[PDB]
Design a protein around this ligand. Structure first.
Ligand SMILES: [Ca+2]
Length: 256
């Protein structure tokens, strides 16, 4: 339902929400249930099992939650998304994605991501069990991961959010442990390279005809510990967590 904005050509600092008390974490909004609600999951090794919901940007900055969700399992890494009223996350120490319905607060299902590396086998550059990264864009729900078969290089799959089945799979040429993070826009994977305490998108992979390219799109890295970068196809922004800081970046596009 979202129109492709084009090929990404610029990333800009835009909004700084607050400095959190966790170095790593993720946060997002649900593009398919348009509301002001913000979802928040700070990262704590072997202790992450809660999703916090805020009703607005103001409530979020003020730390006034609407509710907390106790998850049926613990979570690995910062890769979660909320999509069409359901939380998707990587179940701790598995290659499985759990779907958790927020309105009914029950586990809907579980999917095995075939042959996916997990639990600090192929994390992003900072570790944190960030092996499996969910992404939503104009073309739906995606999983970004790596496999032993693809020599630790990023693999992307389309994940049906209704049936939890994989619907398409592409092997890329990019070492996942070399990447800081990654995200999808219009079925194109963008991989971020950055310094931890160059800063750029330096690789793209287009799932339409499976063509990849080396690029150079400067990426802000003001705090030098990128933990999460997730795209939102409703507002065309990046929701970023960087060294305690919770921020949004705006995007500029050329034709695709
Ligand atoms: Ca990501």
């Amino acid at each position: 339902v979202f129109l492709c904005p084009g090929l990404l050509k610029g990333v800009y600092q835009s909004e700084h929400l607050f400095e959190s008390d966790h170095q790593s974490g993720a946060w997002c909004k649900d593009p398919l249930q348009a509301s002001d609600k913000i979802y928040y999951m700070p990262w704590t090794p072997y202790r992450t099992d809660t999703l916090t919901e805020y009703s607005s940007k103001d409530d979020f900055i003020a730390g006034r939650p609407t509710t907390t969700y106790k998850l049926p399992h613990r979570v690995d890494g910062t890769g979660f998304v909320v999509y069409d009223g359901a939380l998707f996350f990587n179940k701790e120490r598995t290659r499985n994605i759990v779907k958790f319905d927020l309105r009914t607060r029950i586990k809907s299902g579980e999917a095995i991501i075939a042959n996916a590396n997990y639990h600090d086998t192929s994390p992003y550059r900072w570790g944190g069990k960030s092996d499996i990264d969910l992404a939503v864009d104009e073309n739906g729900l995606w999983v970004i991961y790596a496999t032993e078969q693809n020599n630790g290089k990023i693999v992307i799959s389309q994940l049906n959010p209704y049936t939890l089945r994989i619907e398409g799979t592409w092997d890329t040429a990019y070492d996942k442990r070399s990447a800081s993070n990654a995200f999808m826009i219009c079925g194109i994977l963008y991989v971020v390279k950055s310094v931890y305490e160059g800063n750029k998108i330096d690789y793209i992979y287009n799932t339409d005809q499976s063509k990849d390219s080396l690029v150079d799109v400067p990426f802000p890295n003001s705090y030098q510990y990128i933990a999460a970068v997730d795209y939102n196809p409703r507002d065309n922004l990046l929701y970023v967590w960087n060294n305690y800081h919770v921020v949004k970046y705006s995007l500029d596009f050329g034709p695709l």
